[PDB]
Protein backbone atom coordinates (compact mmCIF):
# COMPACT_ATOMS: atom_id res chain seq x y z
CA UNK A 1 0.00 0.00 0.00
CA UNK A 2 1.49 3.37 -1.08
CA UNK A 3 1.21 6.50 1.19
CA UNK A 4 -2.11 8.36 0.62
CA UNK A 5 -0.74 11.70 1.90
CA UNK A 6 2.37 13.45 3.31
CA UNK A 7 2.24 14.78 6.94
CA UNK A 8 4.55 17.29 8.65
CA UNK A 9 4.29 18.19 12.38
CA UNK A 10 6.47 20.67 14.32
CA UNK A 11 5.78 22.62 17.58
CA UNK A 12 4.42 26.17 18.11
CA UNK A 13 7.88 27.73 17.43
CA UNK A 14 7.36 30.87 15.26
CA UNK A 15 10.29 32.97 16.61
CA UNK A 16 13.34 33.11 14.27
CA UNK A 17 16.88 31.84 15.04
CA UNK A 18 19.27 34.71 16.08
CA UNK A 19 21.78 33.95 13.24
CA UNK A 20 22.10 37.72 12.53
CA UNK A 21 23.64 38.01 16.06
CA UNK A 22 26.61 35.76 14.96
CA UNK A 23 26.77 36.59 11.22
CA UNK A 24 26.06 40.35 11.66
CA UNK A 25 28.26 40.78 14.77
CA UNK A 26 30.70 43.72 15.21
CA UNK A 27 32.82 41.38 17.46
CA UNK A 28 34.09 37.97 16.37
CA UNK A 29 36.52 36.61 19.00
CA UNK A 30 39.82 35.70 17.30
CA UNK A 31 40.98 32.10 16.61
CA UNK A 32 42.80 31.70 20.00
CA UNK A 33 39.50 32.10 22.01
CA UNK A 34 36.57 31.57 19.56
CA UNK A 35 32.87 32.39 20.27
CA UNK A 36 29.99 29.85 20.51
CA UNK A 37 26.21 30.70 20.58
CA UNK A 38 23.81 27.85 21.40
CA UNK A 39 20.73 28.12 19.19
CA UNK A 40 17.43 26.69 20.61
CA UNK A 41 13.61 26.81 20.32
CA UNK A 42 13.62 28.75 16.98
CA UNK A 43 13.17 28.65 13.13
CA UNK A 44 16.07 29.40 10.72
CA UNK A 45 16.46 29.93 6.98
CA UNK A 46 19.69 28.11 6.00
CA UNK A 47 18.79 28.73 2.30
CA UNK A 48 19.49 32.48 2.93
CA UNK A 49 23.18 31.48 3.26
CA UNK A 50 23.17 30.36 -0.45
CA UNK A 51 20.55 32.85 -1.76
CA UNK A 52 23.07 35.51 -0.57
CA UNK A 53 26.45 35.37 -2.41
CA UNK A 54 29.00 37.27 -0.19
CA UNK A 55 30.67 34.02 1.04
CA UNK A 56 34.03 32.56 -0.10
CA UNK A 57 33.44 29.07 1.42
CA UNK A 58 30.10 27.34 2.30
CA UNK A 59 31.22 23.73 2.85
CA UNK A 60 29.03 21.06 4.48
CA UNK A 61 29.86 17.73 6.18
CA UNK A 62 27.29 14.99 6.94
CA UNK A 63 24.60 17.37 5.46
CA UNK A 64 24.03 19.10 2.08
CA UNK A 65 22.72 22.70 2.01
CA UNK A 66 19.66 22.37 -0.27
CA UNK A 67 17.44 19.70 1.42
CA UNK A 68 18.19 21.10 4.98
CA UNK A 69 14.76 22.70 5.63
CA UNK A 70 13.63 19.03 5.67
CA UNK A 71 15.58 18.43 9.06
CA UNK A 72 15.24 19.70 12.55
CA UNK A 73 18.10 19.56 15.03
CA UNK A 74 18.31 19.24 18.83
CA UNK A 75 20.49 22.36 18.97
CA UNK A 76 23.06 24.20 16.87
CA UNK A 77 26.41 25.29 18.23
CA UNK A 78 27.13 28.32 16.02
CA UNK A 79 30.89 28.79 16.53
CA UNK A 80 32.27 32.20 15.38
CA UNK A 81 35.83 33.51 14.87
CA UNK A 82 38.17 35.58 12.60
CA UNK A 83 41.20 34.30 10.61
CA UNK A 84 43.63 35.14 7.77
CA UNK A 85 42.14 34.08 4.41
CA UNK A 86 44.53 31.35 3.10
CA UNK A 87 44.29 28.89 6.04
CA UNK A 88 40.42 28.70 5.81
CA UNK A 89 40.62 25.06 4.60
CA UNK A 90 42.43 24.01 7.82
CA UNK A 91 39.03 23.89 9.65
CA UNK A 92 37.56 21.09 7.44
CA UNK A 93 37.25 18.12 9.81
CA UNK A 94 40.64 16.57 10.67
CA UNK A 95 42.79 18.41 8.19
CA UNK A 96 45.86 19.27 10.28
CA UNK A 97 48.07 22.36 10.51
CA UNK A 98 48.90 25.21 12.96
CA UNK A 99 45.29 26.48 13.29
CA UNK A 100 43.64 22.99 13.67
CA UNK A 101 46.02 21.46 16.31
CA UNK A 102 46.42 24.61 18.48
CA UNK A 103 43.19 26.65 18.03
CA UNK A 104 40.09 25.08 16.42
CA UNK A 105 40.23 21.31 15.84
CA UNK A 106 36.89 20.19 14.36
CA UNK A 107 35.80 16.57 15.25
CA UNK A 108 37.11 13.61 13.09
CA UNK A 109 33.54 13.02 11.87
CA UNK A 110 31.53 16.24 11.74
CA UNK A 111 27.86 17.03 10.99
CA UNK A 112 28.15 20.77 10.27
CA UNK A 113 28.52 23.69 7.86
CA UNK A 114 31.74 25.80 7.63
CA UNK A 115 30.94 29.28 6.28
CA UNK A 116 33.41 32.14 5.62
CA UNK A 117 33.81 35.60 3.95
CA UNK A 118 36.51 38.24 3.40
CA UNK A 119 36.22 40.87 6.17
CA UNK A 120 39.06 43.23 5.06
CA UNK A 121 36.69 46.23 4.55
CA UNK A 122 35.45 46.15 8.22
CA UNK A 123 38.30 44.63 10.35
CA UNK A 124 41.61 45.39 8.67
CA UNK A 125 43.26 48.27 10.67
CA UNK A 126 46.22 50.66 9.93
CA UNK A 127 47.84 49.53 13.25
CA UNK A 128 47.81 45.83 12.02
CA UNK A 129 44.84 44.86 14.31
CA UNK A 130 46.84 43.27 17.20
CA UNK A 131 43.43 42.73 18.93
CA UNK A 132 43.06 39.56 16.78
CA UNK A 133 45.41 36.70 17.77
CA UNK A 134 46.06 32.98 17.11
CA UNK A 135 47.90 30.43 19.32
CA UNK A 136 51.03 28.80 17.83
CA UNK A 137 52.57 27.14 20.94
CA UNK A 138 50.95 24.57 23.30
CA UNK A 139 52.42 21.67 25.39
CA UNK A 140 50.06 19.30 23.46
CA UNK A 141 47.53 19.66 20.59
CA UNK A 142 43.89 19.98 21.83
CA UNK A 143 40.89 17.59 21.65
CA UNK A 144 37.77 18.48 19.56
CA UNK A 145 35.87 21.72 20.53
CA UNK A 146 38.23 22.07 23.55
CA UNK A 147 38.73 25.78 24.48
CA UNK A 148 41.91 26.99 26.20
CA UNK A 149 42.28 30.75 26.90
CA UNK A 150 45.51 30.44 29.02
CA UNK A 151 48.48 32.72 28.06
CA UNK A 152 51.32 31.46 30.37
CA UNK A 153 54.85 31.12 28.87
CA UNK A 154 55.85 27.99 26.84
CA UNK A 155 59.40 26.48 26.48
CA UNK A 156 61.09 24.89 23.39
CA UNK A 157 64.04 23.45 25.43
CA UNK A 158 65.31 22.96 29.04
CA UNK A 159 65.59 26.79 29.59
CA UNK A 160 63.39 27.75 32.64
CA UNK A 161 60.81 30.49 31.82
CA UNK A 162 59.57 31.41 35.37
CA UNK A 163 56.46 33.17 33.88
CA UNK A 164 58.29 35.63 31.48
CA UNK A 165 59.38 35.58 27.80
CA UNK A 166 62.99 35.51 26.43
CA UNK A 167 65.37 33.21 24.49
CA UNK A 168 63.66 29.75 24.40
CA UNK A 169 60.76 31.35 26.46
CA UNK A 170 57.60 31.94 24.37
CA UNK A 171 54.37 33.90 24.68
CA UNK A 172 51.92 31.30 23.19
CA UNK A 173 50.08 33.48 20.61
CA UNK A 174 50.56 36.25 17.99
CA UNK A 175 48.53 38.52 15.66
CA UNK A 176 48.01 37.88 11.94
CA UNK A 177 48.90 41.58 11.21
CA UNK A 178 45.69 42.68 9.38
CA UNK A 179 46.87 45.83 7.58
CA UNK A 180 44.30 46.89 4.84
CA UNK A 181 47.21 46.43 2.38
CA UNK A 182 47.66 42.62 2.28
CA UNK A 183 47.41 39.73 -0.21
CA UNK A 184 44.00 37.92 0.04
CA UNK A 185 45.70 35.00 1.88
CA UNK A 186 46.82 37.39 4.69
CA UNK A 187 43.67 39.62 4.70
CA UNK A 188 41.18 38.95 7.57
CA UNK A 189 38.13 36.71 6.96
CA UNK A 190 35.05 36.26 9.20
CA UNK A 191 34.13 32.58 9.82
CA UNK A 192 31.22 30.82 11.50
CA UNK A 193 30.76 27.06 11.86
CA UNK A 194 27.32 25.55 12.46
CA UNK A 195 27.64 22.22 14.34
CA UNK A 196 24.25 20.42 14.10
CA UNK A 197 23.02 17.69 16.54
CA UNK A 198 20.62 14.80 15.61
CA UNK A 199 20.58 12.63 18.93
CA UNK A 200 17.21 11.45 20.42
CA UNK A 201 15.57 13.90 17.90
CA UNK A 202 14.12 16.43 20.49
CA UNK A 203 14.47 19.17 17.82
CA UNK A 204 14.43 22.82 18.97
CA UNK A 205 16.37 24.36 16.02
CA UNK A 206 14.49 24.31 12.76
CA UNK A 207 14.24 25.10 9.06
CA UNK A 208 11.24 27.06 7.63
CA UNK A 209 8.04 25.45 9.10
CA UNK A 210 4.94 25.08 6.79
CA UNK A 211 3.46 22.14 8.86
CA UNK A 212 0.32 20.05 7.94
CA UNK A 213 -2.76 18.44 9.73
CA UNK A 214 -3.10 14.79 10.90
CA UNK A 215 -4.51 11.69 9.17
CA UNK A 216 -5.53 8.52 11.12
CA UNK A 217 -6.26 4.84 10.34
CA UNK A 218 -4.88 5.01 6.71
CA UNK A 219 -1.36 4.83 5.25
CA UNK A 220 0.68 8.11 5.06
CA UNK A 221 4.24 9.38 4.84
CA UNK A 222 5.12 11.47 7.94
CA UNK A 223 7.55 13.80 9.70
CA UNK A 224 7.41 14.64 13.45
CA UNK A 225 10.21 17.02 14.65
CA UNK A 226 12.35 15.72 11.69
CA UNK A 227 11.87 11.99 12.60
CA UNK A 228 10.30 10.45 9.47
CA UNK A 229 8.89 7.29 7.85
CA UNK A 230 5.77 5.75 6.26
CA UNK A 231 2.91 4.22 8.31
CA UNK A 232 -0.73 3.83 9.37
CA UNK A 233 -0.92 6.38 12.20
CA UNK A 234 -3.59 5.54 14.86
CA UNK A 235 -4.83 6.62 18.30
CA UNK A 236 -3.00 4.47 20.93
CA UNK A 237 -3.14 3.06 24.49
CA UNK A 238 0.60 3.89 25.03
CA UNK A 239 0.80 5.42 28.56
CA UNK A 240 3.86 7.64 27.92
CA UNK A 241 5.39 9.35 30.95
CA UNK A 242 5.11 13.14 30.27
CA UNK A 243 8.76 13.65 29.14
CA UNK A 244 8.81 10.79 26.53
CA UNK B 1 72.68 21.75 20.15
CA UNK B 2 74.02 21.60 23.71
CA UNK B 3 77.53 22.78 22.72
CA UNK B 4 78.68 25.91 24.65
CA UNK B 5 81.00 26.74 21.71
CA UNK B 6 78.19 27.15 19.12
CA UNK B 7 77.23 30.83 18.61
CA UNK B 8 74.48 30.52 15.93
CA UNK B 9 72.01 27.62 15.33
CA UNK B 10 69.46 29.01 12.81
CA UNK B 11 67.14 26.22 11.59
CA UNK B 12 65.51 26.43 8.11
CA UNK B 13 62.34 24.25 8.01
CA UNK B 14 63.86 22.21 10.93
CA UNK B 15 64.52 22.23 14.72
CA UNK B 16 67.55 20.98 16.80
CA UNK B 17 65.06 19.58 19.38
CA UNK B 18 63.40 17.34 16.72
CA UNK B 19 66.72 16.69 14.83
CA UNK B 20 68.23 14.00 17.11
CA UNK B 21 65.41 11.47 16.40
CA UNK B 22 65.08 12.75 12.78
CA UNK B 23 66.38 10.36 10.02
CA UNK B 24 68.00 11.96 6.92
CA UNK B 25 69.63 10.15 3.95
CA UNK B 26 70.93 13.33 2.22
CA UNK B 27 71.48 16.96 3.55
CA UNK B 28 75.16 17.97 3.24
CA UNK B 29 77.35 20.42 5.27
CA UNK B 30 80.12 23.10 4.68
CA UNK B 31 82.88 24.67 6.91
CA UNK B 32 84.27 28.27 6.58
CA UNK B 33 85.54 31.43 8.41
CA UNK B 34 83.66 34.79 8.64
CA UNK B 35 83.69 38.36 10.05
CA UNK B 36 81.03 37.95 12.77
CA UNK B 37 78.77 40.98 12.03
CA UNK B 38 78.01 39.80 8.42
CA UNK B 39 77.18 36.15 9.40
CA UNK B 40 73.45 36.97 8.71
CA UNK B 41 74.26 36.92 4.93
CA UNK B 42 74.39 33.07 5.08
CA UNK B 43 70.56 33.02 5.48
CA UNK B 44 68.07 32.62 2.53
CA UNK B 45 66.24 35.36 0.59
CA UNK B 46 68.64 38.32 1.26
CA UNK B 47 71.56 40.12 -0.51
CA UNK B 48 75.18 41.02 0.38
Amino acid at each position, epitope marked *: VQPTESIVRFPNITNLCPFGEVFNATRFASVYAWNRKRISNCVADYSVLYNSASFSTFKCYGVSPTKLNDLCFTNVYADSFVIRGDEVRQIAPGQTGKIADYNYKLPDDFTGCVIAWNSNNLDSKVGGNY*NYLYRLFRKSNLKPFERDISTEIYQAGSTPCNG*V*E*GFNCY*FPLQ*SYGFQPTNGVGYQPYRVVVLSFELLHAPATVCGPKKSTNLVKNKCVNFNFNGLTGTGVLTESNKKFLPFQ | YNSASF*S*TFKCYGVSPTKLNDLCFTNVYADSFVIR*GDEV*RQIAPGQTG
Partner: antibody
Amino acid sequence: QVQLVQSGAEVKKPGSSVKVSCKASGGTFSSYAISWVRQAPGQGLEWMGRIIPMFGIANYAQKFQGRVTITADKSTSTAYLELSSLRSEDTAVYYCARYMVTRDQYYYDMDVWGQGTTVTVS
Amino acid sequence: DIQMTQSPSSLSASVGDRVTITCRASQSISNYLNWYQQKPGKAPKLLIYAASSLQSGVPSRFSGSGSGTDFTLTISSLQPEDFATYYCQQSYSPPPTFGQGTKLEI
Protein backbone atom coordinates in the same frame (compact mmCIF):
# COMPACT_ATOMS: atom_id res chain seq x y z
CA GLN C 1 51.22 54.79 15.47
CA VAL C 2 50.36 55.15 19.25
CA GLN C 3 52.08 57.52 21.75
CA LEU C 4 52.05 56.77 25.52
CA VAL C 5 50.95 59.64 27.86
CA GLN C 6 51.64 59.68 31.61
CA SER C 7 50.90 61.18 35.11
CA GLY C 8 52.57 64.43 36.36
CA ALA C 9 55.41 64.63 38.94
CA GLU C 10 55.07 64.03 42.74
CA VAL C 11 56.90 65.41 45.82
CA LYS C 12 56.74 63.03 48.83
CA LYS C 13 58.20 61.89 52.25
CA PRO C 14 60.40 58.87 53.27
CA GLY C 15 58.34 55.77 54.26
CA SER C 16 55.45 56.95 51.97
CA SER C 17 53.52 54.95 49.31
CA VAL C 18 52.77 56.46 45.88
CA LYS C 19 50.66 56.30 42.64
CA VAL C 20 51.48 56.88 38.91
CA SER C 21 49.65 55.98 35.63
CA CYS C 22 50.07 55.77 31.82
CA LYS C 23 47.64 55.45 28.85
CA ALA C 24 47.43 55.33 25.04
CA SER C 25 46.98 58.37 22.72
CA GLY C 26 46.66 58.42 18.87
CA GLY C 27 45.70 54.68 19.18
CA THR C 28 44.87 51.95 21.79
CA PHE C 29 46.38 48.98 23.78
CA SER C 30 45.89 46.22 21.13
CA SER C 31 47.42 43.44 23.33
CA TYR C 32 50.90 45.04 23.64
CA ALA C 33 52.88 44.32 26.78
CA ILE C 34 53.50 47.47 28.81
CA SER C 35 56.39 47.78 31.26
CA TRP C 36 57.76 50.17 33.89
CA VAL C 37 61.34 51.47 34.24
CA ARG C 38 63.28 53.72 36.71
CA GLN C 39 65.81 56.31 35.58
CA ALA C 40 67.76 57.08 38.75
CA PRO C 41 69.40 60.48 37.88
CA GLY C 42 72.36 59.69 35.53
CA GLN C 43 72.55 55.89 36.29
CA GLY C 44 71.55 52.86 34.13
CA LEU C 45 67.82 52.16 33.51
CA GLU C 46 66.15 49.67 35.95
CA TRP C 47 63.23 47.46 34.79
CA MET C 48 60.42 47.14 37.39
CA GLY C 49 57.94 44.70 35.76
CA ARG C 50 55.63 43.52 32.90
CA ILE C 51 51.83 43.68 32.49
CA ILE C 52 49.59 42.90 29.45
CA PRO C 53 46.31 44.96 29.53
CA MET C 54 44.49 42.31 27.39
CA PHE C 55 44.97 39.56 30.09
CA GLY C 56 45.91 41.35 33.40
CA ILE C 57 48.83 38.91 34.08
CA ALA C 58 51.90 40.72 35.51
CA ASN C 59 55.50 40.11 36.74
CA TYR C 60 58.18 41.97 38.79
CA ALA C 61 61.96 41.83 39.25
CA GLN C 62 63.00 40.74 42.82
CA LYS C 63 64.28 44.36 43.35
CA PHE C 64 60.63 45.60 43.11
CA GLN C 65 58.54 42.49 44.06
CA GLY C 66 56.27 43.32 47.06
CA ARG C 67 57.62 46.95 47.02
CA VAL C 68 55.62 47.66 43.77
CA THR C 69 52.29 46.54 42.26
CA ILE C 70 50.82 47.31 38.78
CA THR C 71 47.34 46.99 37.11
CA ALA C 72 45.63 47.87 33.78
CA ASP C 73 42.19 48.28 32.09
CA LYS C 74 41.71 47.60 28.33
CA SER C 75 38.25 49.25 28.87
CA THR C 76 39.98 52.70 28.90
CA SER C 77 43.46 51.73 27.47
CA THR C 78 45.17 52.67 30.80
CA ALA C 79 47.88 51.16 33.08
CA TYR C 80 48.74 51.93 36.73
CA LEU C 81 51.70 51.59 39.14
CA GLU C 82 51.95 51.93 42.93
CA LEU C 83 55.16 51.78 45.01
CA SER C 84 55.75 51.48 48.82
CA SER C 85 58.50 52.01 51.48
CA LEU C 86 59.61 55.17 49.56
CA ARG C 87 63.13 56.76 49.72
CA SER C 88 65.65 54.08 50.55
CA GLU C 89 66.97 55.27 47.11
CA ASP C 90 63.66 55.72 45.18
CA THR C 91 64.10 59.37 43.99
CA ALA C 92 63.88 58.78 40.21
CA VAL C 93 62.07 59.47 36.92
CA TYR C 94 59.61 56.62 36.27
CA TYR C 95 58.62 55.70 32.66
CA CYS C 96 56.23 53.31 31.00
CA ALA C 97 57.26 51.65 27.73
CA ARG C 98 55.32 49.28 25.39
CA TYR C 99 56.63 46.23 23.53
CA MET C 100 54.87 43.76 21.20
CA VAL C 101 54.87 40.39 23.09
CA THR C 102 52.25 39.04 20.56
CA ARG C 103 53.95 40.12 17.25
CA ASP C 104 57.00 37.80 16.87
CA GLN C 105 59.04 35.34 19.06
CA TYR C 106 61.11 38.38 20.20
CA TYR C 107 60.52 40.62 23.19
CA TYR C 108 61.27 43.71 25.35
CA ASP C 109 61.88 46.04 22.33
CA MET C 110 60.70 49.20 24.16
CA ASP C 111 59.97 51.19 20.96
CA VAL C 112 57.70 53.87 22.57
CA TRP C 113 58.15 55.46 26.03
CA GLY C 114 55.86 57.57 28.27
CA GLN C 115 56.35 61.29 29.11
CA GLY C 116 58.11 60.34 32.43
CA THR C 117 56.97 60.94 36.06
CA THR C 118 59.44 62.33 38.64
CA VAL C 119 58.86 60.91 42.15
CA THR C 120 61.12 62.63 44.72
CA VAL C 121 61.55 63.98 48.31
CA SER C 122 62.04 67.67 49.35
CA ASP D 1 71.20 34.96 35.66
CA ILE D 2 72.87 37.81 33.65
CA GLN D 3 74.73 40.89 34.90
CA MET D 4 75.59 43.66 32.35
CA THR D 5 78.07 46.51 31.80
CA GLN D 6 78.59 49.06 28.97
CA SER D 7 81.74 50.89 27.76
CA PRO D 8 83.40 53.36 27.50
CA SER D 9 81.90 55.75 30.15
CA SER D 10 82.02 58.65 27.60
CA LEU D 11 83.56 59.92 24.30
CA SER D 12 84.01 63.29 22.48
CA ALA D 13 83.55 63.71 18.71
CA SER D 14 82.41 65.95 15.78
CA VAL D 15 79.21 66.08 13.67
CA GLY D 16 79.60 63.75 10.64
CA ASP D 17 82.28 61.58 12.41
CA ARG D 18 82.11 57.75 13.08
CA VAL D 19 82.00 56.58 16.77
CA THR D 20 81.63 53.09 18.42
CA ILE D 21 80.11 51.84 21.74
CA THR D 22 80.12 48.33 23.39
CA CYS D 23 77.78 46.15 25.46
CA ARG D 24 79.17 43.41 27.83
CA ALA D 25 77.40 40.70 29.88
CA SER D 26 77.84 37.45 31.94
CA GLN D 27 76.59 35.03 29.20
CA SER D 28 75.88 34.21 25.52
CA ILE D 29 72.79 36.30 24.50
CA SER D 30 71.96 34.68 21.06
CA ASN D 31 71.51 38.18 19.49
CA TYR D 32 68.49 38.90 21.83
CA LEU D 33 69.51 42.55 22.59
CA ASN D 34 68.19 46.16 22.02
CA TRP D 35 69.80 49.65 21.81
CA TYR D 36 68.25 53.01 22.87
CA GLN D 37 69.06 56.74 23.22
CA GLN D 38 67.78 59.80 25.20
CA LYS D 39 68.57 63.40 26.12
CA PRO D 40 68.46 63.52 30.01
CA GLY D 41 64.85 63.47 31.37
CA LYS D 42 63.30 63.06 27.82
CA ALA D 43 61.39 59.97 26.66
CA PRO D 44 63.94 57.42 25.21
CA LYS D 45 63.86 56.06 21.60
CA LEU D 46 65.01 52.65 20.21
CA LEU D 47 67.59 52.37 17.36
CA ILE D 48 68.30 48.62 17.00
CA TYR D 49 66.26 45.59 18.21
CA ALA D 50 68.72 42.66 17.75
CA ALA D 51 72.55 42.28 17.52
CA SER D 52 72.38 44.28 14.19
CA SER D 53 68.79 44.98 12.93
CA LEU D 54 67.85 48.71 12.58
CA GLN D 55 64.23 49.66 13.48
CA SER D 56 61.91 50.87 10.65
CA GLY D 57 61.78 54.71 10.40
CA VAL D 58 65.18 55.06 12.19
CA PRO D 59 67.69 56.50 9.61
CA SER D 60 70.87 54.54 8.59
CA ARG D 61 72.90 56.61 11.18
CA PHE D 62 73.58 53.39 13.17
CA SER D 63 74.81 49.79 12.77
CA GLY D 64 75.18 46.89 15.27
CA SER D 65 78.62 45.29 14.70
CA GLY D 66 78.15 42.30 17.06
CA SER D 67 77.16 38.60 17.36
CA GLY D 68 76.44 36.15 20.26
CA THR D 69 77.28 38.52 23.18
CA ASP D 70 79.43 41.59 24.19
CA PHE D 71 78.10 43.49 21.14
CA THR D 72 79.03 46.86 19.57
CA LEU D 73 76.88 49.70 18.19
CA THR D 74 78.47 52.23 15.82
CA ILE D 75 77.22 55.69 15.08
CA SER D 76 77.59 56.31 11.29
CA SER D 77 77.97 60.03 10.38
CA LEU D 78 77.27 61.40 13.90
CA GLN D 79 74.28 63.80 14.11
CA PRO D 80 73.98 66.69 16.65
CA GLU D 81 71.00 64.60 18.01
CA ASP D 82 73.58 61.82 18.77
CA PHE D 83 74.73 64.01 21.69
CA ALA D 84 72.15 61.73 23.44
CA THR D 85 73.05 59.16 26.16
CA TYR D 86 73.06 55.57 24.73
CA TYR D 87 71.91 52.31 26.43
CA CYS D 88 72.23 48.60 25.54
CA GLN D 89 69.74 46.01 26.94
CA GLN D 90 69.63 42.17 26.93
CA SER D 91 66.28 40.55 25.97
CA TYR D 92 67.67 36.98 26.37
CA SER D 93 66.17 36.43 29.89
CA PRO D 94 64.03 38.20 32.55
CA PRO D 95 64.57 40.78 33.91
CA PRO D 96 65.42 42.48 30.51
CA THR D 97 68.52 44.17 31.95
CA PHE D 98 70.01 47.47 30.64
CA GLY D 99 73.69 48.52 30.59
CA GLN D 100 75.03 51.49 32.66
CA GLY D 101 74.85 53.75 29.54
CA THR D 102 77.41 56.05 27.82
CA LYS D 103 77.66 59.78 26.85
CA LEU D 104 78.80 61.31 23.52
CA GLU D 105 80.09 64.95 23.47
CA ILE D 106 80.00 67.13 20.29
